[PDB]
Symmetry: C2
Subunit: 193 residues, 2 copies
Amino acid sequence: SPLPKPVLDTNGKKLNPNSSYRIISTFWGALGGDVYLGKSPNSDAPCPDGVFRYNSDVGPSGTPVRFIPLSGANIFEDQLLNIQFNIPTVKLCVSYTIWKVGNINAHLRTMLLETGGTIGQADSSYFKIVKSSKFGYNLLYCPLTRHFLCPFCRDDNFCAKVGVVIQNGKRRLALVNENPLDVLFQEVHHHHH
Amino acid sequence: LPKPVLDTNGKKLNPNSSYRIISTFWGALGGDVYLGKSPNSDAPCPDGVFRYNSDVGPSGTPVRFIPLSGANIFEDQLLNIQFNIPTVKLCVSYTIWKVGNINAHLRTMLLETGGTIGQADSSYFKIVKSSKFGYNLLYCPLTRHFLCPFCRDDNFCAKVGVVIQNGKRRLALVNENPLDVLFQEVHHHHH
Protein backbone atom coordinates (compact mmCIF):
# COMPACT_ATOMS: atom_id res chain seq x y z
CA SER A 1 0.00 0.00 0.00
CA PRO A 2 2.61 2.70 0.85
CA LEU A 3 5.04 3.86 -1.79
CA PRO A 4 8.72 4.00 -0.78
CA LYS A 5 10.47 6.96 0.81
CA PRO A 6 13.36 8.79 -0.95
CA VAL A 7 16.63 9.16 0.91
CA LEU A 8 17.51 12.84 1.35
CA ASP A 9 20.84 14.62 1.46
CA THR A 10 21.74 17.30 3.99
CA ASN A 11 20.01 19.92 1.81
CA GLY A 12 16.75 17.96 1.84
CA LYS A 13 17.12 16.87 -1.78
CA LYS A 14 16.48 13.32 -2.95
CA LEU A 15 19.60 11.23 -3.50
CA ASN A 16 20.51 10.90 -7.18
CA PRO A 17 22.65 8.12 -8.71
CA ASN A 18 24.24 10.79 -10.93
CA SER A 19 25.44 12.81 -7.91
CA SER A 20 28.34 12.40 -5.48
CA TYR A 21 27.99 12.42 -1.68
CA ARG A 22 30.24 12.36 1.33
CA ILE A 23 29.07 10.00 4.07
CA ILE A 24 29.38 12.18 7.15
CA SER A 25 28.67 11.53 10.80
CA THR A 26 26.17 13.26 13.06
CA PHE A 27 29.04 13.83 15.54
CA TRP A 28 31.30 16.87 16.01
CA GLY A 29 34.83 17.64 17.12
CA ALA A 30 36.78 14.57 18.21
CA LEU A 31 33.73 12.37 17.54
CA GLY A 32 32.97 13.60 14.02
CA GLY A 33 34.81 12.21 11.04
CA ASP A 34 33.65 11.33 7.54
CA VAL A 35 33.92 7.95 5.80
CA TYR A 36 37.02 7.58 3.64
CA LEU A 37 39.03 5.04 1.64
CA GLY A 38 42.10 3.90 3.55
CA LYS A 39 44.28 0.83 4.12
CA SER A 40 45.11 -1.29 7.14
CA PRO A 41 48.88 -1.84 7.58
CA ASN A 42 48.48 -5.63 7.31
CA SER A 43 46.40 -5.60 4.15
CA ASP A 44 47.94 -7.50 1.24
CA ALA A 45 45.93 -5.61 -1.39
CA PRO A 46 47.79 -3.56 -4.02
CA CYS A 47 45.46 -0.57 -3.56
CA PRO A 48 43.75 1.03 -0.52
CA ASP A 49 41.02 -1.48 0.31
CA GLY A 50 39.53 -0.38 3.66
CA VAL A 51 36.43 1.61 4.54
CA PHE A 52 37.23 3.81 7.55
CA ARG A 53 35.98 7.02 9.02
CA TYR A 54 38.24 9.73 10.37
CA ASN A 55 39.00 9.90 14.09
CA SER A 56 37.79 13.51 14.29
CA ASP A 57 36.46 16.27 12.07
CA VAL A 58 39.78 18.13 12.45
CA GLY A 59 41.32 16.74 9.31
CA PRO A 60 40.28 15.79 5.79
CA SER A 61 36.73 15.63 4.57
CA GLY A 62 35.45 12.26 3.41
CA THR A 63 35.85 10.39 0.16
CA PRO A 64 32.80 10.94 -2.09
CA VAL A 65 30.60 8.00 -3.04
CA ARG A 66 27.87 7.22 -5.52
CA PHE A 67 24.94 4.87 -4.95
CA ILE A 68 23.99 2.32 -7.63
CA PRO A 69 20.50 0.86 -7.11
CA LEU A 70 20.12 -2.84 -7.86
CA SER A 71 17.27 -1.77 -10.16
CA GLY A 72 15.92 1.56 -11.37
CA ALA A 73 17.17 5.14 -11.11
CA ASN A 74 15.75 6.19 -7.74
CA ILE A 75 17.33 5.84 -4.29
CA PHE A 76 14.74 4.95 -1.64
CA GLU A 77 14.95 3.92 1.98
CA ASP A 78 15.16 0.12 2.37
CA GLN A 79 16.33 -0.40 -1.24
CA LEU A 80 19.24 -2.65 -2.22
CA LEU A 81 22.14 -0.81 -3.84
CA ASN A 82 25.90 -0.91 -4.35
CA ILE A 83 28.18 1.77 -2.90
CA GLN A 84 31.27 2.98 -4.74
CA PHE A 85 33.81 5.67 -3.94
CA ASN A 86 33.32 8.12 -6.81
CA ILE A 87 36.95 9.13 -7.38
CA PRO A 88 39.52 9.10 -10.15
CA THR A 89 41.94 6.18 -9.86
CA VAL A 90 44.65 4.29 -11.66
CA LYS A 91 43.39 1.49 -13.90
CA LEU A 92 44.44 -1.34 -11.60
CA CYS A 93 42.62 0.15 -8.59
CA VAL A 94 39.15 0.65 -10.13
CA SER A 95 37.63 -2.32 -8.29
CA TYR A 96 39.05 -0.94 -5.03
CA THR A 97 36.51 1.88 -5.19
CA ILE A 98 33.61 -0.60 -4.93
CA TRP A 99 32.45 -1.44 -1.41
CA LYS A 100 32.27 -5.04 -0.22
CA VAL A 101 32.23 -6.95 3.06
CA GLY A 102 35.30 -8.98 3.99
CA ASN A 103 35.58 -12.30 5.74
CA ILE A 104 35.17 -12.69 9.48
CA ASN A 105 38.06 -11.06 11.33
CA ALA A 106 39.04 -13.34 14.21
CA HIS A 107 40.52 -10.62 16.43
CA LEU A 108 37.65 -8.13 16.09
CA ARG A 109 34.99 -10.89 15.84
CA THR A 110 33.16 -9.30 12.90
CA MET A 111 33.37 -8.58 9.17
CA LEU A 112 35.06 -5.36 8.07
CA LEU A 113 33.92 -3.12 5.23
CA GLU A 114 36.43 -3.28 2.36
CA THR A 115 36.68 -2.39 -1.28
CA GLY A 116 37.50 -4.59 -4.24
CA GLY A 117 33.92 -5.66 -4.95
CA THR A 118 31.69 -5.70 -8.03
CA ILE A 119 28.62 -3.75 -9.13
CA GLY A 120 25.29 -5.21 -10.17
CA GLN A 121 26.31 -8.88 -10.14
CA ALA A 122 25.34 -11.90 -8.09
CA ASP A 123 28.66 -11.66 -6.22
CA SER A 124 28.24 -7.95 -5.44
CA SER A 125 27.78 -6.60 -1.90
CA TYR A 126 24.37 -4.92 -1.56
CA PHE A 127 23.55 -2.36 1.13
CA LYS A 128 20.39 -0.55 2.17
CA ILE A 129 19.89 2.93 3.61
CA VAL A 130 17.36 3.04 6.46
CA LYS A 131 16.16 5.83 8.74
CA SER A 132 17.99 5.84 12.05
CA SER A 133 16.11 5.89 15.35
CA LYS A 134 18.13 9.04 16.11
CA PHE A 135 19.38 11.49 13.48
CA GLY A 136 20.19 10.57 9.93
CA TYR A 137 20.41 7.10 8.41
CA ASN A 138 22.04 3.74 8.98
CA LEU A 139 23.63 1.50 6.38
CA LEU A 140 22.67 -2.17 6.41
CA TYR A 141 24.51 -4.98 4.63
CA CYS A 142 22.15 -7.56 3.11
CA PRO A 143 23.82 -10.80 2.01
CA LEU A 144 21.95 -12.34 -0.91
CA THR A 145 23.75 -15.71 -0.83
CA ARG A 146 20.73 -17.85 0.05
CA HIS A 147 18.64 -15.79 -2.36
CA PHE A 148 20.85 -16.39 -5.39
CA LEU A 149 21.46 -20.05 -4.49
CA CYS A 150 17.70 -20.77 -4.30
CA PRO A 151 15.96 -17.64 -5.61
CA PHE A 152 12.99 -18.09 -3.38
CA CYS A 153 13.32 -21.31 -1.51
CA ARG A 154 12.34 -19.44 1.62
CA ASP A 155 13.05 -15.78 2.33
CA ASP A 156 15.23 -14.82 5.29
CA ASN A 157 15.48 -11.05 4.80
CA PHE A 158 18.58 -10.89 7.00
CA CYS A 159 20.58 -7.66 6.98
CA ALA A 160 23.38 -6.59 9.34
CA LYS A 161 23.91 -3.10 10.72
CA VAL A 162 27.02 -1.14 9.73
CA GLY A 163 28.95 0.39 12.62
CA VAL A 164 32.55 1.04 13.65
CA VAL A 165 35.23 -1.05 15.37
CA ILE A 166 38.54 0.37 16.54
CA GLN A 167 41.40 -1.17 14.54
CA ASN A 168 44.99 -0.02 15.12
CA GLY A 169 43.62 3.13 16.73
CA LYS A 170 41.42 3.96 13.73
CA ARG A 171 37.67 3.83 13.18
CA ARG A 172 37.05 0.92 10.78
CA LEU A 173 33.55 0.45 9.37
CA ALA A 174 32.32 -3.05 10.15
CA LEU A 175 29.23 -5.08 10.88
CA VAL A 176 27.82 -4.59 14.38
CA ASN A 177 24.95 -6.02 16.40
CA GLU A 178 24.13 -2.76 18.19
CA ASN A 179 24.72 0.98 17.87
CA PRO A 180 24.94 1.43 14.10
CA LEU A 181 26.75 4.43 12.68
CA ASP A 182 24.36 7.35 12.12
CA VAL A 183 25.21 8.99 8.79
CA LEU A 184 24.14 11.87 6.60
CA PHE A 185 24.79 12.40 2.90
CA GLN A 186 26.53 15.63 1.90
CA GLU A 187 26.31 16.42 -1.82
CA VAL A 188 29.57 17.63 -3.38
CA HIS A 189 30.33 18.55 -6.96
CA HIS A 190 33.04 20.22 -8.98
CA HIS A 191 33.07 23.98 -9.36
CA HIS A 192 34.87 24.64 -12.67
CA HIS A 193 36.57 21.29 -13.27
CA LEU B 1 62.70 25.41 -26.06
CA PRO B 2 60.36 24.81 -23.13
CA LYS B 3 60.43 21.28 -21.73
CA PRO B 4 57.14 19.53 -20.94
CA VAL B 5 56.66 18.03 -17.49
CA LEU B 6 55.98 14.28 -17.67
CA ASP B 7 53.76 12.01 -15.60
CA THR B 8 54.73 8.53 -14.45
CA ASN B 9 53.52 7.09 -17.77
CA GLY B 10 55.77 9.47 -19.72
CA LYS B 11 52.89 11.60 -21.01
CA LYS B 12 53.08 15.37 -20.94
CA LEU B 13 51.17 16.98 -18.10
CA ASN B 14 47.82 18.32 -19.32
CA PRO B 15 45.81 21.08 -17.57
CA ASN B 16 42.68 19.04 -18.45
CA SER B 17 43.95 16.02 -16.48
CA SER B 18 44.20 15.17 -12.79
CA TYR B 19 47.30 13.91 -11.00
CA ARG B 20 48.32 12.65 -7.62
CA ILE B 21 51.59 14.12 -6.39
CA ILE B 22 53.49 11.07 -5.17
CA SER B 23 56.85 10.43 -3.52
CA THR B 24 59.84 8.87 -5.26
CA PHE B 25 60.32 6.72 -2.13
CA TRP B 26 58.76 3.32 -1.39
CA GLY B 27 57.36 2.36 2.00
CA ALA B 28 58.00 4.32 5.20
CA LEU B 29 59.37 7.32 3.31
CA GLY B 30 56.55 7.13 0.77
CA GLY B 31 53.28 9.02 1.08
CA ASP B 32 51.23 11.05 -1.38
CA VAL B 33 50.28 14.72 -1.05
CA TYR B 34 46.79 15.23 0.38
CA LEU B 35 44.37 17.90 1.60
CA GLY B 36 44.26 17.93 5.40
CA LYS B 37 43.83 20.25 8.37
CA SER B 38 45.90 21.11 11.33
CA PRO B 39 44.31 21.72 14.73
CA ASN B 40 44.39 25.35 15.76
CA SER B 41 43.20 26.07 12.20
CA ASP B 42 40.21 28.40 12.36
CA ALA B 43 39.46 27.68 8.70
CA PRO B 44 35.92 26.60 7.77
CA CYS B 45 37.28 23.88 5.45
CA PRO B 46 40.35 21.65 5.30
CA ASP B 47 43.09 24.14 4.51
CA GLY B 48 46.46 22.39 4.82
CA VAL B 49 48.69 20.67 2.28
CA PHE B 50 50.24 17.54 3.79
CA ARG B 51 51.67 14.25 2.67
CA TYR B 52 50.97 10.87 4.22
CA ASN B 53 53.41 9.48 6.79
CA SER B 54 53.88 6.30 4.72
CA ASP B 55 52.60 4.82 1.48
CA VAL B 56 50.57 2.23 3.39
CA GLY B 57 47.33 4.11 3.86
CA PRO B 58 45.26 6.34 1.59
CA SER B 59 46.17 7.57 -1.88
CA GLY B 60 46.76 11.25 -2.45
CA THR B 61 44.29 14.00 -3.32
CA PRO B 62 44.28 14.67 -7.09
CA VAL B 63 45.43 18.08 -8.34
CA ARG B 64 45.27 20.01 -11.58
CA PHE B 65 47.86 22.52 -12.78
CA ILE B 66 46.83 25.90 -14.19
CA PRO B 67 49.51 27.74 -16.23
CA LEU B 68 49.58 31.49 -15.76
CA SER B 69 50.09 31.80 -19.52
CA GLY B 70 49.29 29.44 -22.36
CA ALA B 71 47.82 25.98 -22.70
CA ASN B 72 50.84 23.80 -21.88
CA ILE B 73 52.60 22.83 -18.66
CA PHE B 74 56.35 23.34 -18.98
CA GLU B 75 59.26 23.11 -16.58
CA ASP B 76 60.19 26.40 -14.92
CA GLN B 77 56.96 28.25 -15.79
CA LEU B 78 54.52 29.86 -13.36
CA LEU B 79 51.28 28.02 -12.62
CA ASN B 80 48.73 27.59 -9.88
CA ILE B 81 47.94 24.27 -8.21
CA GLN B 82 44.44 23.21 -7.17
CA PHE B 83 43.06 20.05 -5.64
CA ASN B 84 40.71 18.74 -8.34
CA ILE B 85 37.93 17.41 -6.12
CA PRO B 86 34.21 17.93 -5.64
CA THR B 87 33.32 20.16 -2.68
CA VAL B 88 30.54 22.16 -1.12
CA LYS B 89 30.30 25.75 -2.37
CA LEU B 90 31.80 27.13 0.86
CA CYS B 91 35.06 25.23 0.34
CA VAL B 92 35.85 25.91 -3.35
CA SER B 93 38.62 28.39 -2.54
CA TYR B 94 39.99 25.84 -0.09
CA THR B 95 40.98 23.60 -2.98
CA ILE B 96 43.35 26.24 -4.33
CA TRP B 97 46.92 26.04 -3.10
CA LYS B 98 48.49 29.07 -1.47
CA VAL B 99 51.50 29.77 0.70
CA GLY B 100 50.74 31.07 4.18
CA ASN B 101 52.45 33.64 6.36
CA ILE B 102 55.56 32.89 8.40
CA ASN B 103 54.72 30.28 11.04
CA ALA B 104 56.34 31.38 14.29
CA HIS B 105 56.85 27.86 15.66
CA LEU B 106 58.57 26.58 12.50
CA ARG B 107 60.08 29.80 11.01
CA THR B 108 58.91 29.00 7.50
CA MET B 109 55.75 29.37 5.43
CA LEU B 110 53.45 26.35 5.17
CA LEU B 111 51.50 25.30 2.09
CA GLU B 112 47.76 25.94 2.62
CA THR B 113 44.59 26.21 0.60
CA GLY B 114 42.21 29.13 0.31
CA GLY B 115 44.00 30.96 -2.51
CA THR B 116 43.05 32.42 -5.89
CA ILE B 117 43.89 31.47 -9.49
CA GLY B 118 45.41 33.68 -12.15
CA GLN B 119 45.48 36.90 -10.11
CA ALA B 120 48.09 39.17 -8.56
CA ASP B 121 47.30 37.71 -5.12
CA SER B 122 47.60 34.08 -6.28
CA SER B 123 50.40 31.76 -5.18
CA TYR B 124 52.47 30.76 -8.22
CA PHE B 125 54.56 27.59 -8.30
CA LYS B 126 56.98 26.19 -10.87
CA ILE B 127 57.75 22.54 -11.58
CA VAL B 128 61.48 21.94 -12.07
CA LYS B 129 63.61 18.87 -12.62
CA SER B 130 65.11 17.52 -9.40
CA SER B 131 68.80 16.81 -8.97
CA LYS B 132 67.53 13.31 -8.02
CA PHE B 133 64.76 11.32 -9.69
CA GLY B 134 61.56 13.24 -10.29
CA TYR B 135 60.62 16.89 -9.94
CA ASN B 136 60.56 19.61 -7.32
CA LEU B 137 57.92 22.29 -6.75
CA LEU B 138 59.14 25.86 -6.28
CA TYR B 139 57.13 28.72 -4.81
CA CYS B 140 57.75 31.96 -6.73
CA PRO B 141 56.52 34.95 -4.69
CA LEU B 142 55.61 38.04 -6.68
CA THR B 143 56.35 40.23 -3.62
CA ARG B 144 59.73 41.67 -4.60
CA HIS B 145 58.62 42.13 -8.22
CA PHE B 146 55.67 44.28 -7.12
CA LEU B 147 57.48 46.10 -4.29
CA CYS B 148 60.83 46.76 -5.96
CA PRO B 149 60.89 45.71 -9.62
CA PHE B 150 64.51 46.85 -10.07
CA CYS B 151 65.85 45.27 -6.91
CA ARG B 152 68.16 42.28 -7.25
CA ASP B 153 67.00 38.68 -7.64
CA ASP B 154 63.29 39.40 -7.74
CA ASN B 155 62.81 36.05 -9.48
CA PHE B 156 63.93 34.07 -6.40
CA CYS B 157 61.80 30.97 -5.89
CA ALA B 158 61.87 28.79 -2.77
CA LYS B 159 61.82 25.00 -2.99
CA VAL B 160 58.92 23.10 -1.43
CA GLY B 161 59.77 20.47 1.18
CA VAL B 162 58.27 19.03 4.35
CA VAL B 163 58.32 20.04 8.00
CA ILE B 164 56.94 17.92 10.82
CA GLN B 165 53.94 19.63 12.44
CA ASN B 166 51.97 17.81 15.15
CA GLY B 167 53.37 14.47 14.03
CA LYS B 168 52.36 15.00 10.38
CA ARG B 169 54.33 15.74 7.22
CA ARG B 170 53.30 19.30 6.30
CA LEU B 171 54.39 20.75 2.98
CA ALA B 172 56.30 23.98 3.50
CA LEU B 173 59.14 26.07 2.11
CA VAL B 174 62.41 24.16 2.68
CA ASN B 175 64.78 25.59 0.10
CA GLU B 176 67.72 23.20 0.60
CA ASN B 177 65.85 19.92 1.19
CA PRO B 178 63.12 19.79 -1.45
CA LEU B 179 60.51 17.08 -1.73
CA ASP B 180 61.12 14.96 -4.83
CA VAL B 181 57.75 14.26 -6.47
CA LEU B 182 56.21 12.41 -9.41
CA PHE B 183 52.85 13.00 -11.05
CA GLN B 184 50.51 10.01 -11.25
CA GLU B 185 47.65 10.48 -13.69
CA VAL B 186 44.25 9.40 -12.39
CA HIS B 187 40.85 9.52 -14.02
CA HIS B 188 37.34 8.20 -13.62
CA HIS B 189 36.29 4.75 -14.86
CA HIS B 190 32.50 5.00 -14.64
CA HIS B 191 32.00 1.90 -16.82
